[PDB]
Amino acid sequence: GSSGSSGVILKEEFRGVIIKQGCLLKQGHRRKNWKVRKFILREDPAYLHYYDPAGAEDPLGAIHLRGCVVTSVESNSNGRKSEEENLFEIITADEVHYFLQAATPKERTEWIKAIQMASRTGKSGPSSG
Structure with a gap:
């Protein structure tokens, strides 16, 4: 659900489009x-x-x-129970690691590829790599 007609100024970090959306379980240090x-x-x-x-x-x-x-x-x-299922680590430019959790076993993969697709960018940007 991403659509708007004459609402508010358009930020910069959001000067793009959506590829995938959903709820994820972001882990923490304290654990x-x-x-x-x-x-x-x-x-x-x-x-x-x-x-x-x-x-x-x-x-x-x-x-x-x-x-x-x-x-x-x-x-x-x-x-049984499975405290945590379907997870993945996503390293950032800061080397920061984040362990998320996907509902379905298909989302976990999709997400990855999803992030990859974006992270892949199209070259030409702020420094980039």
């Missing part, structure tokens, strides 16, 4: 349970913004993809 968050990906520019599902207005933050990296995790996942 105290996960927290559902609406992770929105936008290519050109290549950035990942995540807002609050409860409501909120602005994005809690953003993840630079100017030269981020995508990778899969181990995620044992075996037995």
